[PDB]
Structures are given as structure tokens and as C-alpha cells.
Amino acid sequence: RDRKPFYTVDLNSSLTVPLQSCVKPPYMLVVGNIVIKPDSQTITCENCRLLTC
Amino acid sequence: NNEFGTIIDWAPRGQFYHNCSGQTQSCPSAQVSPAVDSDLTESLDKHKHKKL
Amino acid sequence: QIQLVQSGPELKKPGETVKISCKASGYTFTIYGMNWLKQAPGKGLKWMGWINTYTGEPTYADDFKGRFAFSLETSASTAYLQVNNLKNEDTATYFCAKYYDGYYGWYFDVWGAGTTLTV
Amino acid sequence: IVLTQSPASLAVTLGQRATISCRGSESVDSYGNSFMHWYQQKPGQPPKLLIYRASNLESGIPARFSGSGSRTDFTLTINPVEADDVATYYCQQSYEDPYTFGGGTKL
Ligand SMILES: *[C@@H]1O[C@H](CO)[C@@H](O[C@@H]2O[C@H](CO)[C@@H](O[C@@H]3O[C@H](CO[C@H]4O[C@H](CO)[C@@H](O)[C@H](O)[C@@H]4O)[C@@H](O)[C@H](O[C@H]4O[C@H](CO)[C@@H](O)[C@H](O)[C@@H]4O)[C@@H]3O)[C@H](O)[C@H]2NC(C)=O)[C@H](O)[C@H]1NC(C)=O
Ligand SMILES: *[C@@H]1O[C@H](CO)[C@@H](O[C@@H]2O[C@H](CO)[C@@H](O)[C@H](O)[C@H]2NC(C)=O)[C@H](O)[C@H]1NC(C)=O
Ligand SMILES: *[C@@H]1O[C@H](CO)[C@@H](O[C@@H]2O[C@H](CO)[C@@H](O)[C@H](O)[C@H]2NC(C)=O)[C@H](O)[C@H]1NC(C)=O
Incomplete structure (x- = not known):
């Protein structure tokens, strides 16, 4: 281009893969509005959900 | 890196860039991420194209 | 068009200093x-x-x-x-040139007129 | 990188091919481009670039001039030699600091 070298990177995609990640007992996941207070070292949540995957 | 502690990661992170060493002053020094967050959510069935 | 005009020739002696101009247009x-x-x-x-x-x-x-x-x-x-x-080894013509840009573009298409120097 | 340009002085008559050979201590090929350049300098004048990147004819140069060259080996060709080609030709290297020029070749 314009009598100088020109480099083009082309990338295309038509493939997506769905995954599932799980932990096992005695481990669980707490999902929601999780608040961490570093001064009092407290973790608090209202209406979180317990999940595995 | 804050009052909750410092977390570091020694695994590599990949990006596109130009060497720019031994080049003229027109060589861009910015690094480019080829894919963004919307490439994993928006238009899953639609074909995606990236040109650099 | 791109033109690089240099200064005219100058006469000098050892121990002094020279200033050279190259205006790009x-x-x-x-x-x-x-x-x-x-x-x-x-x-x-x-x-x-x-x-x-x-x-x-x-x-x-x-x-x-x-x-x-x-x-x-x-x-x-x-x-x-x-x-x-x-010094006495500085008797030479001095050129100002514009490189051809791009990848490894340290080659010159537009040159200055020239400036002869003797010391 | 040191460049050796041969012959030091070439004597060719009008209407005959003229060939100048330039070498290098190291390769100058990078990412599909060979960075060897040919200049022409007439006395009292700044050099004018003739062939850039070893194969490309500069705009405004007459079609008589043509360049060619492989890795570390490059050549300059002038088939229809005229009387205005009497000058010195230098092979230049633009791949490494200080981008050294050539010694010269009289013709
Ligand atoms: C690991 O675990 C994950 C759990 O998330 C599994 O992911 C699931 O993978 C399956 C395929 O294996 C996915 O099923 C696909 O869902 C879609 C269904 O279409 C939805 O949307 C349309 C409207 O657009 C509605 O009409 C329809 O009812 C659905 O709500 C489609 O993408 C797929 O079906 C289409 O394609 C097939 C083939 O091309 C055709 O036959 C169909 O007719 C249709 O066109 C398909 O059914 C599922 O959604 C994933 N779950 C998620 C993302 O939560 C992984 O599969 C699993 N991996 C392994 C290796 O086990
Ligand atoms: C990116 O596009 C290329 C074509 O430009 C795709 O490669 C072709 O894919 C089709 C559909 O599966 C095949 O029939 C062809 O044989 C493939 N090759 C060619 C040369 O056409 C490629 O699959 C795309 N990449 C992704 C990740 O989807
Ligand atoms: C840009 O290219 C230069 C030239 O090849 C690279 O510099 C080399 O770096 C390695 C690793 O440190 C050294 O061993 C070589 O001596 C260097 N060669 C030189 C200076 O000519 C440089 O690493 C590249 N930059 C990148 C890839 O980011």
C-alpha cells in the first residue's frame, strides 16, 4: 500500500462451545450481591443463592 | 493491589503488537486485543470477523 | 512537492562551531x-x-x-x-534527507541540496 | 553489516548491458522483504534513489533501470547504456544501524 509493505491479520469465527464448570461437596458456590469488609473482616450477603455449577 | 491484598499472576497474556525497535517514528506502540467481551455474548450464531 | 533546502556554504576554522539549517516544505x-x-x-x-x-x-x-x-x-x-x-577530519558535505517511511524504511528518496564545509 | 560492491569501476560502451554486484556480511531479508537499495549520484548533486527494496523501480526513473537480488546477493542492470549514466552507483542497507551505504562503482 502506497509503495510500502502492508500487513493484514484476518480472523473469522463461526464456532462457539458451551461449557459447564462444577465443584463437588463439601464445596459450594455463593452467588449474589456479596459484600466484603476488610476492616471488620466480614462477608455479608442478602438473598444469595447456593450453587454447584 | 489494594487494601484487600495484592494478587499477581505469572502466566503469560497474549496480545498483538509491533516491535518498533529499529524502526522509524511511525511505528505504533499500542497493543491490541483481537477479541472483546461482546464477542462471547452478542450474536453467538452470527459469523464474527476481525481485521487488523 | 517535498523539498529540503539547506544553508549555503560556510568557511570556518578549528575550534569554532557551525550551525546548519534544513527547512522542510x-x-x-x-x-x-x-x-x-x-x-x-x-x-x-x-x-x-x-x-x-x-x-x-x-x-x-x-x-x-x-x-x-x-x-x-x-x-x-x-x-x-x-x-x-x-577538526581537520570534518571537511565534508552534509546532507539532510527524508527517509521513505514504513517497515525498515531507512532509505532516502528526498535529499537536501547540500552544504559544503571546510575547516 | 559491511557491504562489498563489485566491480570498483566498470567500463561499458553504449548499447551494452552493465551489471553491478553487491554483497553483505549478513542477510537483509525481513518478513517477505529484502531491504537492499540502489542509488545514483552525479558529481555535484545529491544521490537519487533508483531501486528500493531490491526489486522496485522508483517513480520517475526511466524504465531502462531494473533491479534484482536474492538473499545477501543483489545486482543492478542497465541494458541500454546512454551517455547520461556516467555516475557512481551505491548499494545501501536499511536493515541495521547505521544503515551503511556502499563504497561505490564507477561507470
Ligand atoms: C457441557 O454442559 C453445557 C451446559 O451448559 C452444555 O451446553 C449445552 O449444549 C447444548 C448442545 O449440546 C445446547 O443446546 C443448544 O441450544 C439451542 C436451543 O435453541 C434455543 O433457542 C431457540 C431459539 O433460538 C429455541 O427455539 C429453543 O427452544 C432453545 O431455547 C441451539 O443452539 C441448539 O439447537 C439448534 O441446533 C441444533 C443443531 O444445530 C438443531 O438440531 C436444533 O434444532 C437447533 O437449531 C442446541 O439445542 C445447550 O443450549 C447448551 N446449554 C447451555 C448453553 O446452557 C454442553 O453441551 C456440555 N458439553 C458436553 C461436551 O457435554
Ligand atoms: C473461517 O473461514 C474459513 C473460510 O474463509 C472457514 O474454513 C472453511 O470452512 C468451511 C465450513 O466448515 C469448510 O467447508 C471449508 O473447507 C473451510 N476452508 C476453506 C478454505 O474454505 C473456517 O472454518 C472459518 N473459521 C471458523 C473458526 O469458523
Ligand atoms: C525486535 O527485534 C529485535 C531484533 O531482532 C529483537 O532484539 C533481539 O533480542 C534478543 C533477545 O533479547 C537478543 O538476543 C538479540 O540480540 C536482539 N537482536 C538485535 C537487538 O538485533 C527484539 O527482541 C525484538 N523485540 C520484541 C520481539 O519485542
């Missing part, structure tokens, strides 16, 4: 660096270095690091080459 001065080239009569060309017209940072070759200074005037689109404590 026909392109944005801040996007293109300025190169300085030296040619002793009867011999080949030698590359001295270049000045970053976007930041002002000067660079010099391994055989020209000693007593050379690159400066520029952005407002008037002019670059100055300064030689201090002239």
Missing part, C-alpha cells in the same frame, strides 16, 4: 523524522543519525556520538545540526 514536519548524512569528498556516504521531530529526541551513530548535536525548530519546520570543536 511540502509535508507535516511532526510525522517525519529528519536524517543527517555526511560525505567526505571522494569517498562513500555515512549515516550520522536522526532526530525525532515528534519528541525532539536525537539519536547518533556509533562513529558520530562524540561532538554532534541535533536540534530542530518545529514552528519553522527547520532542523539544526551542530558540530563543536571542528
Whole structure:
């Protein structure tokens, strides 16, 4: 281009893969509005959900 | 890196860039991420194209 | 068109200093660096270095690091080459040239008119 | 990187091919481009670039001039030699600081 070298990177995609990640007992996941207070070292949540995957 | 502690990661992170060493002053020094967050959510069935 | 006009010939003596002007006309001065080239009569060309017209940072070759200074005037689109404590080995023509940009673009298509120097 | 350009002086008559050979101590090929350049300098004048990147004819140069060259080996060709080609030709290297020029070749 314009009598100088020109480099083009082309990338295309038509493939997506769905995954599932799980932990096992005695481990669980707490999902929601999780608040961490570093001064009092407290973790608090209202209406979180317990999940595995 | 804050009052909750410092977390570091020694695994590599990949990006596109130009060497720019031994080049003229027109060589861009910015690094480019080829894919963004919307490439994993928006238009899953639609074909995606990236040109650099 | 792009034209690099240099200063006229000058006469000097050892121990003094010389200021050389090279005004660029026909392109944005801040996007293109300025190169300085030296040619002793009867011999080949030698590359001295270049000045970053976007930041002002000067660079010099391994055989020209000693007593050379690159400066520029952005407002008037002019670059100055300064030689201090002239010696008898400095009798040469000095060229200002615009490189051809791009990948490994250290080759020159537009040259200055020239500036003969004797000391 | 040092460059050796041969012959030091070439004597060719009008209407005959002229060939100049330039070598290098190291390769100058990078990412599909060979960075060897040919200049022409007439006395009292700045050099004018003839062939850039070893194969490309500069704009405004007459079609008589043509360049060619492989890795570390490059050549310049002038088939229809005229009387205005009397000058010195240099092979230049633009791949490494200080981007050294050539010694010269009289013709
Ligand atoms: C690991 O675990 C994950 C759990 O998330 C599994 O992911 C699931 O993978 C399956 C395929 O294996 C996915 O099923 C696909 O869902 C879609 C269904 O279409 C939805 O949307 C349309 C409207 O657009 C509605 O009409 C329809 O009812 C659905 O709500 C489609 O993408 C797929 O079906 C289409 O394609 C097939 C083939 O091309 C055709 O036959 C169909 O007719 C249709 O066109 C398909 O059914 C599922 O959604 C994933 N779950 C998620 C993302 O939560 C992984 O599969 C699993 N991996 C392994 C290796 O086990
Ligand atoms: C990116 O596009 C290329 C074509 O430009 C795709 O490669 C072709 O894919 C089709 C459909 O599966 C095949 O029939 C062809 O044989 C493939 N090759 C060619 C040369 O056409 C490629 O699959 C795309 N990449 C992704 C990740 O989807
Ligand atoms: C840009 O390219 C240069 C030139 O190849 C690379 O510099 C080399 O770096 C390695 C690793 O440090 C050294 O062993 C070589 O001596 C260097 N060669 C030189 C200076 O000519 C440089 O690493 C590249 N930059 C990148 C890839 O980011």
C-alpha cells in the first residue's frame, strides 16, 4: 500500500462451545450481591443463592 | 493491589503488537486485543470477523 | 512537492562551531523524522543519525556520538545540526534527507541540496 | 553489516548491458522483504534513489533501470547504456544501524 509493505491479520469465527464448570461437596458456590469488609473482616450477603455449577 | 491484598499472576497474556525497535517514528506502540467481551455474548450464531 | 533546502556554504576554522539549517516544505514536519548524512569528498556516504521531530529526541551513530548535536525548530519546520570543536577530519558535505517511511524504511528518496564545509 | 560492491569501476560502451554486484556480511531479508537499495549520484548533486527494496523501480526513473537480488546477493542492470549514466552507483542497507551505504562503482 502506497509503495510500502502492508500487513493484514484476518480472523473469522463461526464456532462457539458451551461449557459447564462444577465443584463437588463439601464445596459450594455463593452467588449474589456479596459484600466484603476488610476492616471488620466480614462477608455479608442478602438473598444469595447456593450453587454447584 | 489494594487494601484487600495484592494478587499477581505469572502466566503469560497474549496480545498483538509491533516491535518498533529499529524502526522509524511511525511505528505504533499500542497493543491490541483481537477479541472483546461482546464477542462471547452478542450474536453467538452470527459469523464474527476481525481485521487488523 | 517535498523539498529540503539547506544553508549555503560556510568557511570556518578549528575550534569554532557551525550551525546548519534544513527547512522542510511540502509535508507535516511532526510525522517525519529528519536524517543527517555526511560525505567526505571522494569517498562513500555515512549515516550520522536522526532526530525525532515528534519528541525532539536525537539519536547518533556509533562513529558520530562524540561532538554532534541535533536540534530542530518545529514552528519553522527547520532542523539544526551542530558540530563543536571542528577538526581537520570534518571537511565534508552534509546532507539532510527524508527517509521513505514504513517497515525498515531507512532509505532516502528526498535529499537536501547540500552544504559544503571546510575547516 | 559491511557491504562489498563489485566491480570498483566498470567500463561499458553504449548499447551494452552493465551489471553491478553487491554483497553483505549478513542477510537483509525481513518478513517477505529484502531491504537492499540502489542509488545514483552525479558529481555535484545529491544521490537519487533508483531501486528500493531490491526489486522496485522508483517513480520517475526511466524504465531502462531494473533491479534484482536474492538473499545477501543483489545486482543492478542497465541494458541500454546512454551517455547520461556516467555516475557512481551505491548499494545501501536499511536493515541495521547505521544503515551503511556502499563504497561505490564507477561507470
Ligand atoms: C457441557 O454442559 C453445557 C451446559 O451448559 C452444555 O451446553 C449445552 O449444549 C447444548 C448442545 O449440546 C445446547 O443446546 C443448544 O441450544 C439451542 C436451543 O435453541 C434455543 O433457542 C431457540 C431459539 O433460538 C429455541 O427455539 C429453543 O427452544 C432453545 O431455547 C441451539 O443452539 C441448539 O439447537 C439448534 O441446533 C441444533 C443443531 O444445530 C438443531 O438440531 C436444533 O434444532 C437447533 O437449531 C442446541 O439445542 C445447550 O443450549 C447448551 N446449554 C447451555 C448453553 O446452557 C454442553 O453441551 C456440555 N458439553 C458436553 C461436551 O457435554
Ligand atoms: C473461517 O473461514 C474459513 C473460510 O474463509 C472457514 O474454513 C472453511 O470452512 C468451511 C465450513 O466448515 C469448510 O467447508 C471449508 O473447507 C473451510 N476452508 C476453506 C478454505 O474454505 C473456517 O472454518 C472459518 N473459521 C471458523 C473458526 O469458523
Ligand atoms: C525486535 O527485534 C529485535 C531484533 O531482532 C529483537 O532484539 C533481539 O533480542 C534478543 C533477545 O533479547 C537478543 O538476543 C538479540 O540480540 C536482539 N537482536 C538485535 C537487538 O538485533 C527484539 O527482541 C525484538 N523485540 C520484541 C520481539 O519485542
